[PDB]
Point group: C4
Chain length 299, copies 4
């Protein structure tokens, strides 16, 4: 299991989460070969996101794309942590954005992001939610729209005078309370979802895949229980997730990013220590799967 | 008729309006048990409104919820005034918001409020409508949307150098002119309703419940008569309400709130005395009923 | 033809345009009887527009409403100029608004006005369109919405150091070129209409009434010809209207207003002389007809 | 091939692009005959755009309109460059706008332009896209709306301390790679298109005319490939256009404008030299064809 242009190894936290590192040579060739397109050009022309994607897959002998797809579609795995040797300082923020864009567009397409107005977003924490000193709860993304979100991506840009603040993760077949909530009649009841500042949507909190196994579509801030029966059941569901013993805690140094299957993984973030001269900065992307396979058709 | 955790007694104004007071011990236990969620957290996660609701009902031995439901659904009653010993100064505004949220979410759910952007709203009067020195006319809430609003809630936050300004109320089976307006062909004619700064709606001013008795959906500022036949009839309807001898006048001290069935009760507010150093502050919520019962179903 | 509370006489400009004047006594009784509702209250509660309407019709022994209706629906007439003795200075602007509101709501209802945000609008000219020194072209109102506008109302509020600026009017059975444009196949072709800052509408420039006679729906600023065939025909139509010999020129002193049938009359405004200390001010309303009559119905 | 009021000659760049020049006499008569309508009046009343169009065609003995139509609808030609003797300085900007409006409205109608809020737009470059020092890529206009855009118009207003910056053009039957991309199954696959700051649209990148020949609807900034199959194919399509040997390079002096068939021509712009005192200014319009012809009809 040795690949062309990168190395792949299980993480220190779980065998379901794989670490993928691009070599110093692959890194410096990719940055040379995309130096003519600044970050502003990727924002303007979306076919260029698939072009820098092909450039990176070609530099890895067309082994990157089927590997990313097999890993993200395998019920037993479904998640990755990614970096490139030599890209690791806040003064290299532009190079970091280019690298994350190429990986996403081998597996599908990244959707528009309302908070930045682009296909990605950057934000700073001092002294999503930028509230220091508290934990961010585990959730799926994309629950408040009709089309399914298949994947989520998150990258670290700067860090100064900083203690704490790791990322958190949870897989459904590691969640000890799945069968109890899935066999409840409310697991198959469609419910309402809504975000703060368009239209509301209706779907169950659980569904099944093609073989009959469970998948989830949940976040505490945006689900809207219609009555006391739904609302109590959901607050019990929230506690059963946040106190799960299956949660992973992952540091993300300046230069690295996570990428996960959004149907059977959830994610979040830990609290940190205050300091008068503290600084932290992040970047994110989200989207759907699209790929080739052999199946029936007519005419 | 002695209950666990609270006392219940008819008001000095009418036997249709009941006063419900939480003991100093229930109050201090509820504030301790919800101290980890500040008001900002209830704004962010709506299942937490049903959680603080369950916490309060459990502290009353599951006697609060069937009592609130029986009272609000009984055609003969339908209204309540509520407070908690020890919570009574403008410096305790945050504690007041928490208490009102728990009561509402035992009977149904509170709807989004466009003037504050949250599920509740706070406003100040000096020197809805903040016009001093004039009366606010009796009405139902929610007339300018399609779904029915089943209940209304209103709470007092501060008061300084203040004379006057009580709340006003009216029940349909106490209104001496009901039969005259209900048997008119215009009582069953659908009419247009519209608010100031979306879409208009069409419904009659009167309807019936399941037994055939009358209910109302009326406010003077937002109904829009289409011709001289409808417009004269409505201005006669307005005078017949504002001069009714069945109206109740209720002071609401710092710390107390009203909660009423919006289908067969109407509500309003009295005028007050000017003073250079005067100050008054309020809070409100509105929503629909949802509960369990035995009835037919298929498949 | 002597009426209770007012006098009625043909104008100096045409027998199709009648002048209606309320006596000093009717004026001072109406202003007393509506003094408890300031202009701000008519803005807030629309049934009060039909109430001040009934108050004025009652002061005229229920002769005003059938007279206004017979006049506006008669193909041979269709227009009025209205005033009240003693109301004639810029310091009485509020009294003027009250009078015009009562007349309109005996015949139908005035529609929302987007430029002021109320059911009426006021504007000032110095040194619709506030361009001094040029003529405003003849048109119908309401061409860019789906529902028909049956009437138009316009009132004068102030005037200082001012020469020129009369109102202009034209009736279709006085227009020498009607038959030529009505028998053209393009008279019955639906066309597109659009305003500057929602949705566009499609209707012919001409139609017929129930007997088969012609009516119009035209304005130069908002009709949008789709091709050279429609566009040339419309610019010829515009010249044939602006140079018509049937146009009337009407001064409107501080305190008076016009009110006309919008289906077979058009209206506009003349140019004026500049002066460093010049000032002029106006008010308008628009709406549809609604009234009782004997006709067939089922069930 | 000598015409009344203007001269017509093939350009120095291609026989598919014809140059049309109005004489000094036609120019000074047109400016006199439209001097009563300033640019502000053409903005307000759209039938006046067809009026100044008829005025110009009449000054050319009704030979301009069938010539413009025959040229733009002929698959072998389809493009023009236009000017008027004596109109050539930034102080004559208003006269330039009037001339371009008259030509467009003989062949069809110019659509609303969102960046200026009028039927045309003006913009300045210093030191669409105003980025100095880089090339603007070849494209069709109107790809992100449902109705077809048949033509495009572009005019030069000022130029100071300026080196470089010509216009660029490409005809499909001059494009060496047409057959290769047209016979691909993706040429007939409907795809999604979207602009930055309403609704998205779906159409193939290629279609056919009534005889079965190819036409195009493409721009790199607004097409949105749905997967890696579409996205790679489009980035190959972009390179095959930008490096085509069939591209024309056209200077456009102060006072001249281009006008082209948008179904089988594409267009763009070259880079230029920096200078502390540099200045350049432009104007544009776009729309659809509408004209008379002999064909079948019913009833
Ligand atoms: Fe997230
Ligand atoms: Fe209310
Ligand atoms: Fe008008
Ligand atoms: Fe363009």
């Amino acid at each position: 299991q040795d690949y062309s242009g990168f190395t792949l190894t299980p993480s220190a936290q779980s065998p379901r989460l794989l670490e993928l590192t691009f070599t110093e040579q692959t890194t410096k060739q990719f940055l040379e070969q995309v130096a003519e397109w600044p970050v502003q050009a990727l924002e303007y022309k979306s076919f260029l996101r698939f072009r820098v994607a092909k450039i990176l897959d070609d530099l890895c002998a067309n082994q990157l794309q089927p590997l990313l797809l097999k890993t993200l579609l395998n019920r037993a795995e479904g998640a990755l942590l990614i970096n490139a040797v030599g890209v690791d300082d806040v003064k290299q923020a532009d190079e970091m954005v280019k690298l994350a864009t190429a990986v996403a567009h081998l597996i599908g397409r990244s959707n528009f992001d309302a908070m930045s107005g682009q296909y990605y977003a950057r934000f700073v924490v001092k002294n999503y939610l930028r509230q220091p000193h508290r934990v961010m709860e585990l959730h799926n993304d994309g629950t408040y729209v009709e089309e399914i979100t298949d994947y989520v991506l998150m990258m670290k840009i700067d860090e100064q005078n900083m203690q704490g603040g790791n990322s958190l993760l949870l897989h459904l077949d590691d969640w000890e309370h799945l069968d109890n909530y899935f066999r409840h009649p409310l697991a198959r009841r469609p419910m309402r979802f809504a975000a703060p500042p368009s239209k509301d949507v209706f779907h169950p909190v659980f569904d099944v895949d093609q073989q009959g196994r469970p998948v989830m579509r949940y976040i505490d801030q945006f689900v809207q229980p219609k009555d006391f029966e739904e609302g109590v059941w959901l607050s019990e569901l929230s506690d059963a997730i946040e106190t799960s013993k299956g949660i992973l805690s992952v540091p993300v140094p300046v230069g690295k990013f996570l990428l996960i299957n959004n149907l059977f993984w959830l994610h979040g973030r830990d609290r940190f220590t205050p300091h008068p001269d503290l600084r932290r900065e992040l970047m994110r992307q989200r989207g759907y799967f699209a790929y080739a396979s052999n199946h029936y058709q007519t005419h």
